[PDB]
Design a protein around this ligand. Structure first.
Ligand SMILES: Cc1ncc(COP(=O)(O)O)c(CN[C@@H](COP(=O)(O)O)C(=O)O)c1O
Ligand SMILES: Cc1ncc(COP(=O)(O)O)c(C)c1O
Lengths: 418, 408
């Protein structure tokens, strides 16, 4: 009785755009950025329609990569927690790349191909985004050039290998394939690189060679594409007649959480009354959730995109080298930040020691190793268990289980196995 | 409609035992050094030992095992590989039983749960086992976590250090991992077996024997029901052979129907690696299951319990012998045998990955060259054949293996 499957012939056929349903208007963002970006991707940012039809070509690849993903009920975790709540896991880890990121990668590549792009480029550090764009590129028969921070290129090889199995060309950055890259290599032939440097690398290469750049950021389009997870989950839960009392997840930039929660939150906002509790968490080592300044700031280190109004601890923030928690990003998506400032979504932060302890507990109890990023949601369940206990009612929790941790086992090892 | 899901409440409730349905009696285990036999009784779970020569065609899956089956991802889906079909000219229809969909990424968890469960009923204080790829190691580590058993895993050592993430995975499940030869491959089975005889531990076997294959036929029982669900009778059932459990597990429930009805119409093809070529260069004879000789001799296609794979070999299927029941069937011409190089398999793996989007285990990639042969054959006859594949595992923790061969 623990897995709820949505047949592939019943997958949702539109994405959800919360913009029209926000309590107040979203604080507008503040080119080139138009030559390298897919035309429709630019269009969908300002979108005023509540829904965007998913192209049939995109929908077909969604099915190809494992969608719809199941909801799993974590009954053993429930028992451990005293059977005071019910825990439903939306398993985005079940996609072939093991995370929710392929949901927007497929759409970005599709719209690049529509623009008649000769290839797509993107930046990557740890390789989560890179491997997702690599798969999406392969499924559209699109040439992919991935610019990977040279340090990570050697340090975290398995995801490089994954990108290469998918047939992507992977370039250590700064690369000699661009002027901006060659100019840095003349300073240091083994220049360690940065995420910012790789964005500049990927952008210049698309710009100069008639390609398109695939943005993996907190832009409104990206969140919209990922809401296929929430669209599915809404249908699954209504299928077994359970309405969640809590929806929770973690915030890198916030796209995975929003993607799950927004379709539920949209219903409520349109009814005028928010009844559910929404709780998202990040890492206290990178505390933009709980200690962020709400202000206009650069969504990327390259200063490529215009500033967005978001919770941020600054685009130059770097985490301690001990941090293996994976939620390194400095800001929160503008829509989510707006929601947090209005008290609609509650913010939490946990240490990696606390989160990884829960990861370990979850792996032994339920049997599935969560991504280190995902592990930061688990401490929220303890807090919810207590409040439920004081309810007299059994509360239902829906969790964005954003990825598995098989390719992050080295991260866990560095904390858990000394 | 590329994925066929079997609802969990539709999961089969019994295992298939092919022993009564074989064309002729299986060569019984042999035992010279009259110690390994009572030794087997000392380290094996009692009810596992008992099921080894079980006579009932179907064995009820214990409720506790069935419960965990549902927990770790059963039933697994069947996926139709339409993009691969296109690449092969649409000359065949290709269905993949995705045993990779379980929590540890392979079919191994199917018997690991049953062995550990039966060890628990013996009041075992711990279980031991060996592992190569660590697909088995991690499945036993997970099974042990779920049944609250302490687990000691003996890992081949070359794999130990080259596959640290699999070691990390076992440790995340709370198992203790030991490089083999250890402190107390082939050699690993011997290591584990030894360690179990003292202290008070049970040895968990991960293939070859009848009980182990029987436990894995849950996959085949599910697949039979799923194919019927879409009105699809396979012409070919294919897979790869390490010890032969994942292939037997899928095929035996289909092959049983045929043996009982009198006629075998389907084609059965299994592949191994040419670098460890017991499938096509081995001899059907009695040989030792373990290096070290502590275990009763079994009659299988073998290339010697002392065979050691080439350093350059990253393809997996390293065991030296084929399961006795599967060896009987190969000897009788019922199952056809193939072997491919890691170079040819991995090139197919990379193609499959770009086409279908899913990275196969290096073990599983040995089935892909079979598809190419079936498709060329169908092209020449003009007949459009249906193929069911045991997709035994994914390769997410084996990317280092792939890289050593493909990425310079
Ligand atoms: C992914 C996967 N697929 C097939 C098998 C072959 O074993 P069987 O024929 O099913 O019994 C395996 C076996 N993996 C074992 C053995 O390690 P190897 O390195 O020799 O492949 C394991 O210990 O994990 C497999 O993992
Ligand atoms: C598995 C996993 N979970 C969470 C995140 C955080 O990303 P985001 O909040 O932007 O979607 C990432 C990047 C990830 O790979």
């Amino acid at each position: 009785r623990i897995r709820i499957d949505l047949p592939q012939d019943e997958i949702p056929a539109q994405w959800y755009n919360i913009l029209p349903d926000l309590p107040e208007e979203l604080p507008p963002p503040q080119e080139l950025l138009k030559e390298v970006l897919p035309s429709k991707v630019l269009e969908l940012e300002f979108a005023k329609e509540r829904y965007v039809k998913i192209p049939d070509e995109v929908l077909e690849r969604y099915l190809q990569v494992g969608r719809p993903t199941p909801i799993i009920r974590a009954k053993r975790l429930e028992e451990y927690l005293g059977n005071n709540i019910k825990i439903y896991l939306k398993m985005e880890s079940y996609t072939y790349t093991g995370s929710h990121k392929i949901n927007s990668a497929l759409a970005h590549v599709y719209y690049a191909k529509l623009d008649n792009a000769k290839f797509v480029t993107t930046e990557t550090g740890a390789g989560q985004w890179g491997s997702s764009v690599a798969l999406a590129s392969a499924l559209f028969r699109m040439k992919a050039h991935i610019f990977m921070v040279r340090t990570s290129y050697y340090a975290k090889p398995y995801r490089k290998y994954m990108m290469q199995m998918y047939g992507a060309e992977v370039h250590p950055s700064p690369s000699d394939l661009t002027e901006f890259g060659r100019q840095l290599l003349a300073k240091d032939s083994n220049h360690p690189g940065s995420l910012g440097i790789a964005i500049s690398d990927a952008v210049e290469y698309a710009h100069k060679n008639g390609g398109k750049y695939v943005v993996g950021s907190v832009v409104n389009s990206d969140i919209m594409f990922k809401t296929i997870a929430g669209m599915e989950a809404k249908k699954q839960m209504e299928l077994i007649g359970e309405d969640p009392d809590y929806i929770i997840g973690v915030v890198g930039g916030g796209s995975n959480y929003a993607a799950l929660a927004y379709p539920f939150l949209g219903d409520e906002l349109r009814s005028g009354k928010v009844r559910r509790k929404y709780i998202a968490s990040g890492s206290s080592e990178v505390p933009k959730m709980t200690k962020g300044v709400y202000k206009y700031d650069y969504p990327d280190t390259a200063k490529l995109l215009p500033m967005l109004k978001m919770y941020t601890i600054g685009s130059d923030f770097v985490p301690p080298p001990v941090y293996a928690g994976g939620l390194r990003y400095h800001g929160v998506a503008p829509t989510l930040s707006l929601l947090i400032s209005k008290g609609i979504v509650q913010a939490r932060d946990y240490s990696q020691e606390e989160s990884f302890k829960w990861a370990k507990l979850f792996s032994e109890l339920e049997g599935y190793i969560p991504a280190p990023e995902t592990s930061h949601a688990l401490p929220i369940l303890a807090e919810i268990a207590e409040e439920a206990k004081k309810s007299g009612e059994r509360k239902t929790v829906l969790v964005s289980f954003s990825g598995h941790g098989l390719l992050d086992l080295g991260n866990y090892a560095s904390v858990l196995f000394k």
